[PDB]
Design a protein around this ligand. Structure first.
Ligand code: P7D
Ligand code: PHE
Ligand code: K
Ligand code: K
Ligand code: ZN
Length: 358
């Protein structure tokens, strides 16, 4: 009843890049996380929750039938056919076990949502791969096949009659797939903090700027915080959460919080270029527990330094378990660049949120 759920299955390690032995999205990502959770004594304090395969109908909450059929067919393809198809998308690989593992990756999040919404667990973390936040209605993208958290949000709405879901994406990349799926939807609030650099950082989209606030019925319910300098630190994230994200979150009154919990913003990541201490994520996780009765589910997205990502997961897990907020190595003030970005996003979202009108 008062526990923290954890999902991990060996299938999460049974796919990898056949044609690039050094691809950063690899099985060692999750096995290293699991090893550190054990050596830190955190794994044994969690409630083990079994994974399950997403159903076709659940995938169709977000993805097209044509795309689901195509992805289902990759389990029977030759390596040459997998490479030919993978190259039709931006930055993906395929593997005979990718579809099977991707279905368990979605399902792991749904399993935690079930436990949390029925008050059987307080919160949970899925240690899943492949990641999801770049996947789109009809295409793979950015190492992702299915959009784990977008499916989970719509599942929570359909299965548990949740009205409002908050998705917080602290991966260093913009989860444009999530943004696109919910762009016109005021019932799912999407917040992303990400490296941008005027579009020079992948995925190079103007829609990743803070001027993209949602459209149609969804205006105000998409919040982008783009960083335009590398080297951001814990203080930059803490400031953004205290004065932008959490004021909006309390005004929105979500009934479930889903976190796209990537750790490629952590110190040492080979792709992210940021300097956030892993301990920062204990603090960010604590803040999110005050909303939605603490009904909080984290799911692994990116993070490609094996040690840094494990440390980030552990720091988040200590907070889910209710351990004391840890002292931070560098509790410095935010930098000028971060403050410019935060001010501009606040400016763009001001008309929609009373809690930002200060
Ligand atoms: C093939 N070798 C060189 C690895 C590689 C390095 C860089 C790029 S990239 O810059 O084009 N790119 C595309 C997607 C992402 C991020 C994914 C993510 O982490 N989401 O969380 C980054 C692609 C591939
Ligand atoms: N709330 C004050 C100052 C302010 C301006 C713009 C953004 C945030 C605060 C006006 O209105
Ligand atoms: K992000
Ligand atoms: K939205
Ligand atoms: Zn990422």
């Amino acid at each position: 009843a008062t526990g923290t759920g954890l999902v991990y299955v060996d299938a999460f390690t049974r796919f990898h890049c056949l044609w690039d032995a050094s691809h950063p999205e690899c099985p060692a990502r999750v096995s290293t996380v699991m090893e550190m959770l054990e050596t830190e004594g955190l794994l044994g304090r969690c409630v083990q929750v079994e994974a399950r395969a997403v159903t076709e109908d659940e995938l169709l909450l977000v993805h097209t039938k044509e795309y689901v059929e195509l992805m289902k067919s990759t389990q029977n393809m030759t390596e040459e056919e997998l490479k030919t198809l993978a190259e039709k998308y931006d930055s993906v690989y395929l593997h005979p076990g990718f579809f099977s593992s991707a279905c368990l990756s979605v399902g792991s999040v749904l399993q935690l949502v079930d436990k949390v919404m029925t008050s059987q667990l307080r919160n949970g973390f899925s240690i899943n791969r492949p990641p999801g936040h770049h996947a789109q209605a009809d295409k793979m993208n950015g190492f992702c096949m299915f959009n784990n958290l977008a499916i989970a949000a719509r599942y929570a709405q359909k299965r548990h009659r949740v009205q409002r879901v908050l998705i917080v994406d602290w991966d260093v990349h913009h989860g444009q797939g999530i943004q696109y799926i919910f762009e016109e939807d005021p019932s799912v609030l999407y917040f992303s903090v990400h490296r941008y650099e005027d579009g020079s950082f992948w995925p190079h989209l103007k829609e990743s700027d803070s001027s993209s606030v949602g459209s149609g019925a969804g205006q105000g319910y998409n919040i982008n915080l783009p960083w335009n300098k590398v080297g951001m630190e814990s203080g930059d994230y803490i400031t953004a959460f205290q004065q932008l994200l959490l004021p909006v979150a309390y005004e929105f009154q979500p009934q479930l919080v889903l976190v796209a919990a990537g750790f490629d913003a952590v110190i040492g990541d080979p792709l992210g270029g940021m300097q956030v201490s892993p301990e920062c994520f204990s603090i960010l996780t604590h803040m999110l527990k005050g909303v939605a009765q603490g009904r909080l589910v984290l799911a692994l997205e990116g993070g490609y330094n094996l040690q840094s990502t494990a440390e980030g997961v552990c720091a988040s897990m200590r907070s889910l378990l209710g351990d004391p907020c840890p002292h931070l190595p560098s509790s410095g003030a935010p930098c000028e660049s971060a403050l410019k970005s935060i001010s501009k996003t606040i400016s763009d979202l001001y008309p929609f949120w009373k809690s930002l009108q200060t």
